[PDB]
């Protein structure tokens, strides 16, 4: 479990920004995969017709 804090924390922004970077990277990956999904769908439609 998480422990309590006995002292004020330093350089909090240098951690918050790192967390934001992680979130941005994950969001980028999630957005990206959808493009591959759409390309696959279009290709599959063409292949089905053929």
């Amino acid at each position: 479990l998480a422990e309590a804090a006995a002292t004020t924390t330093e350089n909090p922004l240098q951690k918050i920004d790192a967390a934001l970077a992680q979130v941005d990277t994950l969001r980028s990956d999630l957005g990206a995969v959808q493009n591959r999904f759409n390309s696959a769908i279009t290709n599959l439609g063409n292949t089905v017709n053929n």
Partner: protein, 51 residues
């Protein structure tokens, strides 16, 4: 940042909407072709049976 994220999401959404609509358009063109072919096939059957 937030209205910015809105700019980004609006843009992405718009790309997706264009994609879906385009797929539908191409599909409907294929429909046009097949419908016409089958329609004249049908008339041919009707006449040759009326024979």
């Amino acid at each position: 940042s937030l209205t910015k994220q809105y700019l980004s999401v609006s843009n992405s959404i718009d790309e997706t909407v264009a994609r879906y609509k385009a797929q539908f358009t191409q599909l409907d063109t294929m429909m046009s072709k097949l419908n016409n072919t089958s329609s004249y096939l049908t008339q041919q059957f009707t006449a040759m049976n009326k024979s």
